[PDB]
Amino acid sequence: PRHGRVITPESRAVYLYEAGRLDFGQVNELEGGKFFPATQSGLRDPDAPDDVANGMPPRDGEIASGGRTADARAQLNEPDSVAHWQKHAVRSGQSLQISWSYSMPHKTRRWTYWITKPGWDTQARLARAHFEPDPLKVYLNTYQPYWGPDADKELIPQGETIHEFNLPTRTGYHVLLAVWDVADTANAFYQVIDLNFA
Numbered sequence: 001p002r003h004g005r006v007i008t009p010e011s012r013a014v015y016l017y018e019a020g021r022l023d024f025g026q027v028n029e030l031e032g033g034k035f036f037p038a039t040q041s042g043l044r045d046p047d048a049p050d051d052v053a054n055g056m057p058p059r060d061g062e063i064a065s066g067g068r069t070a071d072a073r074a075q076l077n078e079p080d081s082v083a084h085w086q087k088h089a090v091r092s093g094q095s096l097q098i099s100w101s102y103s104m105p106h107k108t109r110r111w112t113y114w115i116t117k118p119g120w121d122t123q124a125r126l127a128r129a130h131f132e133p134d135p136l137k138v139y140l141n142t143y144q145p146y147w148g149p150d151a152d153k154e155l156i157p158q159g160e161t162i163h164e165f166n167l168p169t170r171t172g173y174h175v176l177l178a179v180w181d182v183a184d185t186a187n188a189f190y191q192v193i194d195l196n197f198a
Helices: 012-018 072-077 151-155
Strands: 003-008 031-033 088-090 095-103 108-115 137-140 161-166 172-182 187-197
Touching: 003 012, 003 187, 012 072, 012 187, 095 172, 108 161, 137 161
Parallel strands: 088 187
Antiparallel strands: 003 095, 031 187, 095 161, 108 137, 108 172, 172 187
16 A cells, blocks of 8 residues: 655644544545646656656646545535635744654655645635646655656655745635656646635
């Protein structure tokens, strides 16, 4: 089993796990096509030409479950109007440390962090139109090709991945979408994090 999630601040799925509403596998398998916000499969990686081409990224309204809708992971896609997601109290400019944990981590091309626009329709199901077209932060692994002799050390996390950046200027409810792109598969892991800005 190949697993990844954002453990802190607790992702939406982690909070559902703590409430007994998702099991451990489910929280760690929000896996769909990489290269959000693209809406098509078969794209090559813009930085790494030998990387495996993407599968179909999650459609609008299925972003929070990573395109997973056959089981209780579907809960994740409910709008805040209905789910009243638990939201982390945050402030504009605040330094935020993100921690990923894993089981049997994949060879990784990048982690990307996307942020909702000021004025997004906060009561809707999540859609590409809600997110800033430019990522808040990207961490790109440069080692290529993914089958090169030093690939395991250069591309595979050996423990929790810890990222830190400053949140931008916002008020009210916002979503930070954290995405982990796998170099040698079609897929990425999708971890929505719910925020409440002073």
